[PDB]
Amino acid sequence: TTIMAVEFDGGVVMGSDSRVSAGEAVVNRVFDKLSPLHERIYCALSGSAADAQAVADMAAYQLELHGIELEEPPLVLAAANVVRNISYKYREDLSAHLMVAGWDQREGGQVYGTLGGMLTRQPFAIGGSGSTFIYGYVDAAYKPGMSPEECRRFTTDAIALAMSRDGSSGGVIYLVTITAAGVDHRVILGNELPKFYDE
Amino acid sequence: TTIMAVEFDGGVVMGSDSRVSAGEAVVNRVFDKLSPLHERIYCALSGSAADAQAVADMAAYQLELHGIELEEPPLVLAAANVVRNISYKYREDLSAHLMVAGWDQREGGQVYGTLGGMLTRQPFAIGGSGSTFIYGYVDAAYKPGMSPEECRRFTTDAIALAMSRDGSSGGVIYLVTITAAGVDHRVILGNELPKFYDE
Amino acid sequence: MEYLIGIQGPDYVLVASDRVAASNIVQMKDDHDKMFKMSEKILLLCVGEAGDTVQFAEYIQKNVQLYKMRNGYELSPTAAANFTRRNLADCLRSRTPYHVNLLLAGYDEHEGPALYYMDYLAALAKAPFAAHGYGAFLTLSILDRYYTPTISRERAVELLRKCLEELQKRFILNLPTFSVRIIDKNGIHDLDNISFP
Amino acid sequence: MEYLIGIQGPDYVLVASDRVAASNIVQMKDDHDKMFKMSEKILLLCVGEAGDTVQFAEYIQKNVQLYKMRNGYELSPTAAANFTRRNLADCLRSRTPYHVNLLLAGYDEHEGPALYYMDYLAALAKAPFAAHGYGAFLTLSILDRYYTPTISRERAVELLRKCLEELQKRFILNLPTFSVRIIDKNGIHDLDNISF
Amino acid sequence: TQNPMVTGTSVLGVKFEGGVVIAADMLGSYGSLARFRNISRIMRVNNSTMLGASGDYADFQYLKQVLGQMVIDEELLGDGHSYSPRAIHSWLTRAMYSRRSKMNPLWNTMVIGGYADGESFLGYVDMLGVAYEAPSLATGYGAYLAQPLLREVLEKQPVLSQTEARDLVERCMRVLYYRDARSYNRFQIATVTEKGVEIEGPLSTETNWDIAHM
Amino acid sequence: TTIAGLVFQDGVILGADTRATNDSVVADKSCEKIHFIAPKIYCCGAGVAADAEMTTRMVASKMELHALSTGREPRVATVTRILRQTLFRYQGHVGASLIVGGVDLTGPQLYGVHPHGSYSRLPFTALGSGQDAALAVLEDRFQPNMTLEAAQGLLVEAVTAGILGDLGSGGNVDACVITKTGAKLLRTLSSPTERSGRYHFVPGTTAVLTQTVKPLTL
Amino acid sequence: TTTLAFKFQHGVIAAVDSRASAGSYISALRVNKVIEINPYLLGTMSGCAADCQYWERLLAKECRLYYLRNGERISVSAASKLLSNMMCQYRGMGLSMGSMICGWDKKGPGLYYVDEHGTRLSGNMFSTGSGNTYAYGVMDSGYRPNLSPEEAYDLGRRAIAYATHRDSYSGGVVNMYHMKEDGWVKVESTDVSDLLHQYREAN
Amino acid sequence: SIMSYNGGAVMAMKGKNCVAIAADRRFGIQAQMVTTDFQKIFPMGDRLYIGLAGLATDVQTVAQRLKFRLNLYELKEGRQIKPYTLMSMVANLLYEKRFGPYYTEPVIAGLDPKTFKPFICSLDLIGCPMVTDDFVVSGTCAEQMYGMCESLWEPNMDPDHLFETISQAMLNAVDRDAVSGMGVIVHIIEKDKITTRTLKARMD
Amino acid sequence: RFSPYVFNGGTILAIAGEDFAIVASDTRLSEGFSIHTRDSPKCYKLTDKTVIGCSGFHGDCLTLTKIIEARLKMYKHSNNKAMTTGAIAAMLSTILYSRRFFPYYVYNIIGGLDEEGKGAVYSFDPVGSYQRDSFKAGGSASAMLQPLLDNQVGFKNMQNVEHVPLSLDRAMRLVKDVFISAAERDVYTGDALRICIVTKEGIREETVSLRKD
């Protein structure tokens, strides 16, 4: 697995790979790892699929009702805390990392990590097995004040670089761009991945 | 540890970090990991220090006498095979990776990996704990036909990016540039490391 | 380590237990009694881990006595045996499993004499003869040799003698004296303890 | 599991071993002899793991006999005991360690009677009395009670009786019969086997 | 927490004239990996007290959440009563011990700086509920490196000023950056005085690698 | 054990404490951990006390053999090579952590040598259970080309930080300055820490059963 | 530890050593390994000291509580049964406890070995602890049912003394009680090493 | 533990122109004591004795193998061995078994046969020497022996004062150890004479 | 894996005189081969006539002291009087045994005054077995101090020595010299020596220095 969220002026870009591994076997080569929690809040799924989905379902259920009780869309800080508290409470039992991101009327585009029940807002974050191989690239290639297109390029480049090196990551790149205007879903295929040195 | 060798027209650039770890403790923050085997052949030391030095000593001893028996400088293929055969023979016992590189009158500048008694000539190679974090960067940033200066930049950037992320890597960057003209040793300090995103 | 034996007859049941209460390497008591009176016409002979035997046996004893007081008549050997089996089977997959091996010898007025066998797993088996302990490995083949269904009680004691004498000759543990009892129409009957030189 | 006992006197050494050769739960032999004649005035009593006892004891026996043939005189109980210790100590940190517990009872003409003790570790200890096996845990305190340095041999057998009778009363293993032998000026002397 | 994920390394601490100062680098290490290089491991508890934490960051963030709420709950009443530095240290000893004694410890080692009623408080608490006071403190690997240097100065001069204490702490974090593999050269200093709790950062130490030419 | 080393302008200084611990009990209060190798080569002993003892003994003998044959004062690179290749063959089971210091033809030299057979050439180093305290003192206040007076003071301060800070370490600071003109072995250079006693028993208070007196007569 | 107890013509002797031992180190030279529940009821102790002390003090509580409820002193059978039930409820928990409950009641002189497993044996003679075996040897050899009071004391005193001689984890002082129809009497708190020195000098 | 299988206790001590050496007399196997006169101190010359605690088979083996080498030395050299030389001979002997060692912790005590100045030392199982100017201990009651020795020892003690010090140090230490005691023996090594005594110790 | 205990060390000691009771300790707190602190004395005041020494794992020491402090009040609230020294020692057994299956790793020595006025020491093990003593050592240097206390206070292995009782002058000097000897030979004993002296007048505390290495 490789996941990645990126923050900008009035929105977030959010990307994953599509490989569900079972050791050396690929169980599913076309799995969307960007699950919606609310209308303008997603989470990038990583680690155990059974654990990651169950938290996303429970967070979605909790955030649906929480949204209706306030008569407003939930905050991304609220959705990040809902995922945090579940991940923290059952940290021994669960083996998944749900990176949460979206948009608010209040604080705008924002990205949160919830690695083992912690909470931290970052300008970008990366997770899963393939994130190991691209810490150098994301440090090198990230600069602040990127557009939607510059972020989508950067998220594709990083996840493609990881997919090349990580065995557990592979397939297609699924992309989500969240703004005030809405949610732009997009699927960069394995055919049209950005080529680099691969020898 | 982070090590890196790079190949070009009429020579090789060769770089390491300087941290000798003992778990969380730094035993030596200023260790030169680029050991000479011959006048124009070096190896980049990695893994177990005791294992890595003993192979370098034995390879140096073997290659010194081998050089005098031919009445010529040894080939880098010969020095790569000397390191390969030792690493292969005692592969269960040793826990080190000696990347070998240098220059020849015959085949010129060349870089070899000897990971667990194998042998493979690459245009560039990376090794040690910190090499994990920069596989994305070296795939992204490498293009063929680089000068000596472009290679020294690329080797510094990659090893600095790794030193930022890897706990076991750190300190100064030691650099060696091997050509027909000679050996240019250079020490990029921790003060004057190239800055990237580090938050 | 301990040793039990039962020999069913036409109209009776002979039984016998050893009398060593062992501890580590020491024979703490030479006169220990391993038979427990359930009813007037029933004996439970019990062997196993030190505290488990008496606690289990006595729990059963008192519930058999409770059945007598409640209803004005005692349990049959069949009823008593399946009751013993039901308790040991329920404890098996629980916090407190009793490691007990036991014989339930008895006499019903309708059904006649009965000897039952039970390991710590709580498998109940009606038998013409049986035995527990490491001594059973030596003595069971002697019972195969000389037992017939029509064996007289005076002969059955002389058969018992051959089993108990084989333990003195071949079994590495001491076991110098043995309790001996018969059950029939007229209830439980004590007999002379088979001691040796 | 097996049992040895020795009682040194002023001018003699009484010894005794059990006669059970055990296997699993069965008493294969009631008449087994655990004493090995080293010399005319020496007995090695040996107990332990099944094959180790006889192989070790006999290796020593033959080398003690070889010393007699080579030189025209037998080893002393002191010499024989330290020889027994030297072999068992060298095997200890090796491929074939012998797990054997043993008593070496003897009589020297100059030095007089001697009873030696040795565990499988090969620690040699001269003793006025000693015993091996689980039976030693019951019987050693009876020897503390009634032993004196000037004990007569006929009394020493009645002391031995109290140890052996205590094994029948309290020790869980059978051990019905026992070998008994005395060593003095006139060499080894067989005595009646203490049956019950 | 049986197995911690994102650990923070050493937290330093030392008393000075009319105050206390603590320091802790801003790194969350995922084993060898320097994952989170910009996270605050120091916490403002109240006006009188501050808290730095080694070990697992999620357990520290839980303790930050629980303490923060306790201080909120206290400040609602507004009855001229506050938790002293010693009182928070007492509570936190009882918190870690209770969790230790259920075999579900909060995987942290913490330093509690504070100033109240004229007196300076510096207090240690670990995951097992081992607690004490001292003139200086250094958790984790800083116990072996940094605590020697603090006790060296405090032998020669027991009572330091703020600038003496601050320039000492800057000297300690330089040694930790060199010798601790799990440290980083981003850190925060947090002082407490009569004025209250200041948290200055991010800072860096000026390094020196001239010994590499020998 | 806290042992340490330091390169200065005219030479090298080697430091060591005096406590020898058996588990968590102090066996020896006063022992020399700075061992002789050559006239201007000394070595600090840490790790397994027997392995530190016997390797330094063995290499000293090898350097005496090597110096007698060559007719030259031995090189500090040679002791490091001999130690390494001894220690490497035994795969760290010979558990000798050593700081090797000296002067030769090519100047003042300091080497850290670890029991698996790894080595490091350095200007300052520390080893043993209180290495971190001493190494923290060196990092704080080391500079290139120290004076003879400043190096002694720094190296005493390093070994003292271990003595107080580390439970394994204790007692006095032994030291050894190795200038160009010979080596000054400053044993008991410092003493960080300073009773009533007197339990006079009367002769005859101890009860006695046997007495034998063997006269000797020279 | 070494405890012993035997019945004879003139009631019941009960003798114990006093050594406590955390590993090879001697925790304490003189520990009292007999509990005095009432004037007509004692309890010896061996194994884990805290288990022995707690559970036999809890026996004593219930024996004292039996006296107040029923208006009569508890029997030796009932007291021995009640302790074994406490041990039965804590079976498999790693309790180590090796008591003998000595007393006098309507039934006569009574003696019961009670154990950590739940074992509960009525018998004339018993011995517990590490020195168990060495005590039995001396005790059994010199035993008669028809000993005098002084000859009974000589047997119990010697048996503990020769046990402490051989057993590393037993020592200190012999603490010998004597049970009668009119309650127990403490016979002696004699030092063991002085007795062993005395028996050596007799030869 | 291995050392505590047989147990034992050995001690040596310094005075003015004299040295003392002493040890318990227990040979046992775990709980069971076997004999009460087991030799742990062995002569290596007139004014030089060696004491050996721990595993009894190795106590005897190391004593015997050291005597083997001693007698070869004395014949070859044509003299009595110096005390510092015997330490190194033991150190060599024990370190020869570095990775398979004799489980014994020797304690040497003697006077130098030229000058008659006191010498003491002890070694660990692998033969690391430790010379002191005060005392040395070895056994299952090392902690107990240290605490007595540290408090009771004074410098420059006469032969009678040394005996009382070392005896009370042994007796009280071995009385707080289950696997040491059953008598004590003490040798007072002087220039003119060797004074060996056995104490009225506890036998439990 | 997670280990809930750790050895912090330190030594404690108590002596019972005819009219007094000393209870003393070192002030070193350790972990591994580092010193946590040099001012962590193991003596804790309970009542005017009773003090307790506690050594071992310090997390349990802090808790167990706080439990005893809490229970003292609960008794005084119920019974309208302070707990007697013997009643504290009896209560401590039940608290230590209530954690039989997850021990308080705390070697306890209570010392103070019984109801008859005299000195009374009660020594413990971690699970709550106890007895009254004249003297007892505990903690890290238990083995070092105890046989010297057996010798000098018990008069053991001595003859032609009159068995005179301990003066408070003599006992205080003994406590200084034994803790000096422990500090030399024990790594976990050092820094300073707290000595609490319990007489009918009250408690008073001295602080002699020890080795700081």
Ligand SMILES: *[B]([O])([O])[C]([C][C]([C])[C])[N]C(=O)C1=[C]N([C][C][N]C(=O)C2=C(O[C])C(O[C])=C(O[C])[C]=[C]2)N=N1
């Ligand atoms: B991604 O994290 O790889 C992905 C993300 C989900 C949201 C779809 N998760 C999975 O593919 C996944 C794997 N598994 C269970 C099977 N796991 C393993 O076999 C496994 C493996 O093998 C790949 C390895 O590596 C060798 C380890 O070592 C850390 C552990 C488990 N469920 N979902």
Ligand SMILES: *[B]([O])([O])[C]([C][C]([C])[C])[N]C(=O)C1=[C]N([C][C][N]C(=O)C2=C(O[C])C(O[C])=C(O[C])[C]=[C]2)N=N1
């Ligand atoms: B570099 O590879 O880090 C460097 C290169 C040399 C040529 C100088 N080598 C070292 O720093 C080094 C480390 N060590 C021995 C210490 N071992 C380990 O740190 C280690 C550990 O421990 C954390 C672990 O897991 C605990 C593993 O995994 C099994 C491997 C190594 N010698 N030289």
Ligand SMILES: *[B]([O])([O])[C]([C][C]([C])[C])[N]C(=O)C1=[C]N([C][C][N]C(=O)C2=C(O[C])C(O[C])=C(O[C])[C]=[C]2)N=N1
């Ligand atoms: B007595 O049983 O010795 C005595 C009786 C009391 C009433 C005071 N009990 C104790 O002294 C005692 C011992 N312990 C716990 C300590 N146990 C061990 O040290 C230990 C030992 O050594 C005796 C051994 O033997 C080698 C083993 O191995 C089976 C295990 C533990 N608490 N109270």
Ligand code: NA
């Ligand atoms: Na891939």
Ligand code: NA
């Ligand atoms: Na780094």
Ligand code: NA
């Ligand atoms: Na003893």
Ligand code: NA
């Ligand atoms: Na004893």
Ligand code: NA
């Ligand atoms: Na100390």
Ligand code: NA
């Ligand atoms: Na120290």
